[PDB]
Amino acid sequence: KVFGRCELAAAMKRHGLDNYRGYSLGNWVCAAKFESNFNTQATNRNTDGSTDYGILQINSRWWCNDGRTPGSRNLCNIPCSALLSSDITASVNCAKKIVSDGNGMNAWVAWRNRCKGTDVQAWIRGCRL
Ligand code: NA
C-alpha cells in the first residue's frame, strides 16, 4: 500500500508514535517519506547482505527474519514479510523497539540526513489530527 501523507500521519498516531520517546509525529512521517516514499511494500538490499523492509525500512540484520541474513538477529520476533503489510501494526511495534534501543531515531539514516534538525511539523500540516 502507498499511503497518503495525512493518511499515514493518522495511522502512526493511532498506533502510538506521536511523541514516542520524545519524537513528534512529523519526525515519523518525514522518516517514512524518505525511507520508503510511504510505500509499505518497499524493500532495499544492503551491502552487508541484509535487507530493509517496509514503510520504515526495518533491517533484517537486527530486527526481523528474512531467511537470508546469516548470523542476524530477529529482535522484533517477526518475519520481515510481515513488515510489508498494508496494516502497519507490525512495523510500528518494531519501530518502537528500534527507537528505544540507544541511538533513538538515528537508527534511520534517511531521518538523520533529511529530517533531523528540520521543520518536521510541516509533515503534518493540513492533516486532521
Ligand atoms: Na534477521
Curated annotation (Swiss-Prot):
The active site is at E35, D52. It comes from the Eukaryota. The keyword Disulfide bond applies. Disulfide bonds join C6-C127, C30-C115, C64-C80, C76-C94. The keyword Hydrolase applies. Substrate binds at D101. Monomer. This is Lysozyme C. It comes from Gallus gallus.
